[PDB]
Symmetry: D3
Subunit: 208 residues, 6 copies
């Protein structure tokens, strides 16, 4: 299928974003050597994703989907990997310590944002089936329902996490407080980017 190269790229981007959980777990236990190694794994997966992206961009004729849709889809997908690499780099660069009280909830929030990327990977895969009449509406309905569940959870977790940070601001350095808010925001951006992947698929299905 013409979607297979895209599925492979999306699988790589999911792998890259998923490494953020053990990356952060390592920072939390104070094992910076390990966090540095997991960041190399994140960079490798990003580099690999890039190479797949390149080959796709440079490679047809009779087509069941638009070339431009595939390119736009690819663009959204690779942003997820770049976000993961960026976040990990900024964290290593400041040796960011998530405050004790925020550790458990931060990991749960991160994991749920990564689940949003997991949904994107899942929808791209489920699309082979749709490529192999009326079924498109049911597909989009399901996608919407699945995302609403994840968004409800991530919103609640994001709020709790910020509420906790707000209570700790008086005891932290302001610049560190701001970089903690930026990190929560950036993590949330992974889920935003994953939503744009499903939007691009929905546009393709709307073309007939």
């Amino acid at each position: 299928s013409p979607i297979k190269p895209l599925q492979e790229h999306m699988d790589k981007v999911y792998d890259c974003a998923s490494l953020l959980v053990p990356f952060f777990e390592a920072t939390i236990t104070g094992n910076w050597d390990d966090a540095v190694q997991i960041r190399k794994q994140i960079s490798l997966a990003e580099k690999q994703g890039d190479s797949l992206k390149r080959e796709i961009r440079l490679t047809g004729l009779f087509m069941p989907v638009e070339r431009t849709d595939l390119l736009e889809l690819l663009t959204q997908q690779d942003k997820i990997a770049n976000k993961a690499k960026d976040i990990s780099g900024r964290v290593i660069g400041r040796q960011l310590l998530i405050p004790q009280a925020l550790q458990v909830p931060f990991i749960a929030y991160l994991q749920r944002c990564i689940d949003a990327v997991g949904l994107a990977q899942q929808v791209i895969n489920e699309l082979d089936d749709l490529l192999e009449r009326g079924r498109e509406v049911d597909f989009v309905a399901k996608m919407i329902n699945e995302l609403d569940i994840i968004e409800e959870d991530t919103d609640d977790l994001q709020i709790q996490l910020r509420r906790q940070l707000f209570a700790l601001e008086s005891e932290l350095n302001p610049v560190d407080v701001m970089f903690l808010y930026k990190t929560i925001e950036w993590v949330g951006g992974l889920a935003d980017l994953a939503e744009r992947v499903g939007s691009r698929l929905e546009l393709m299905l709307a073309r007939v």
Copy 2:
């Protein structure tokens, strides 16, 4: 492939047109009972072609070719079968006797017009390969070369056949002379219709 139903229809239309050779051979030996039976075979193949045409017209989503191109292709194909059925019916209806001197050349002309339909069937089949970058130009070049060979032969045979009829006009009834010219014309129309099949394929390849 989306072209498979079209290939099947084209195979049926070729079978239907090919029956014109034994149909005419039977009329020439004066076995009208047999010619009547071969005309039922021609009608059956036309009916079968129609049923395939109907199912295609009534039956998608992600598509490597345009729906409208397939419909226009189908329309041109079914004209070939209708032409064969029409010719055979008119011949049975008048009990048309091809004059002795014209028999051999008429059959050779008919056969070569049917070969033009054979080329259409061949190009439709060779298209799977093209469906499985630059190859499209070579495909069209070949198609053009193959048709030029057949057209050169059919033109020469048509001329010789009319030259012979012209010499015999003084000995035949005028209405019969006119119906002999119409039959030569109609046979030639099979090759014209087959050319329109290859033209429709060429248009599809031009869309990218």
Copy 3:
């Protein structure tokens, strides 16, 4: 609806073709003065159809159908009116007398060919409803069924009519025999042209 100007043109083309029945009825009773007047009515309706055609060709923006489909549809429609005008002119020009024995069957054949034009008018009208998801397949299925009924009848009548002419050839002038076959053919062409109208509509429905 964007189809309304097309429906109006089709209504005019149907009116023009329908005048062929009383036109021929007049020739059969030997009232050539009346046939000449009905031919002026046929020419008027053709002129009127032309003026509608012109205004459409010269006259948008947001469109529920393709401009080019409407133009191609219009082209097929106006051929029907031109055919009626041509047939009537040739008949007046030769003062064509349909032989006695062929009169009743010729009129029934003509009427049934005109019914094929009536089907085209009917399908164009029924299209407003379709313009006001899955319904398109049922529409085409119905159109196919309606045409198959008319084609079965016209084929049978055409055969009977030619069989009768064949029996009378020995008693007629050959040129007159040939012009009688041409007239049967031309009448049959009205139904062929009407079929091309429904084909163009089917192509439009295939675009989504």
Copy 4:
């Protein structure tokens, strides 16, 4: 301009059809050797037109017009040349003598049908200007007006020519009478084919 190869082909097709006037003038003066030579000129121009057709079919990227429109335009254009070659061949093959009384009017009818081809050549050329907003409607309006003038003339001439033939039928051989009607028809077909050229241009302008 992408239209330049099409203009060149159309110029060749016009040249080919125009040779029919001196071809027929030669037959009328009984100089069959000359008519045979002018028929070789007609065949040469057709062969040349074919070679241009071939190169176009085999030869882009960023395009101001649709590739498929150019191919369909080309197809209509080359039919005109094939018609001229066919007519000239059939006339040489029967050594067709146009009756004395029909000679002058036949040539005037032929010339006016060729003028219809001249209009097609003219519209294709005037299209460069349109290729170099609202101007498209005025262009089509003019084309329609120019064609209406030619069609009015050709219709009148065709009628007069058939009226004259009708008066002479009693003195000619029936087969010859029929081949004279076929020749008038075929000549008229040149103007029909030229009209289809302008229709294809009108469709292109309707795409925006």
Copy 5:
């Protein structure tokens, strides 16, 4: 009109964003209970907008506009409502007090950013008229002129507001200063998002 569901969604998104003025007015008078209630109104309007969005995404055939354009338009529209809900939530979560000196100018800046959303609502509505030739250029010209007026005002107000904040930084907590800059930025984002709505409409008009 196919635009009606979009107009309804845009009306809801405007209502949702407009509630930010009384929401902020309540925070400024220290009535947090009221601000909390107005935030529930903002959430309700967002939820309602979502439900309209969902029904549109799941619901044709003959279309005067592209399905994908409507989906992209809808996506931009719903971002405005999400922005309003997000801003109100963050403000309630920190119990953000806009400093006294900034209150009047902040409200005027907010109101003018909301006017930019009002322009989007207005252009979507004015589009029915355009849906019911040359008029599209005048429409876009007007839209551009209307936006230039609003952008000139919002830019000036944004600058004055930041200039005032800059003067007060020495007397505030740094984290609070940063969250005040973020709030000004976020408000400005409403006007940015509204501009993207008009851009999507302009793209639709460019398709013909």
Copy 6:
């Protein structure tokens, strides 16, 4: 070429962004009067870019590229100029002093981000050549290679610059530290926006 107005706009946007180097050089030497004048030059170039943008938006027929692609391209281009104007305004508004140690590296980072805009200008220009078959893949390959070189450099410089800022945070006011990070981010955004210009061109080339 239809791309010429776009090339002119891109040239203006490049000029506008390039003025950021002498603008910042002036701030670094403490010549605020000069920085204010260079900011007027930046605003002028932005105003000029806007006027070109407007004329393009308001101004065809036969087109080698899609109107909507040109509009989307234009939108991405004008964001670069708006970013330059915004950055310069914020810097003048706070009288931002880049710390001594960061001056040299900041200018080198800025210059390299501007080189990314230079690449966009270069690719838009090189596109005339492509507008005057297989060449499109080589074009995109080159563009990718050129960008990878610039991105490698900008990433390294951005990291070094943040590492240096991190070391100086203890000696600066927190709000100033945050506005220094925002300025590095904004500068980096110029290169992000330039990448989106090349992406839009790549999409156009993918349409055939």
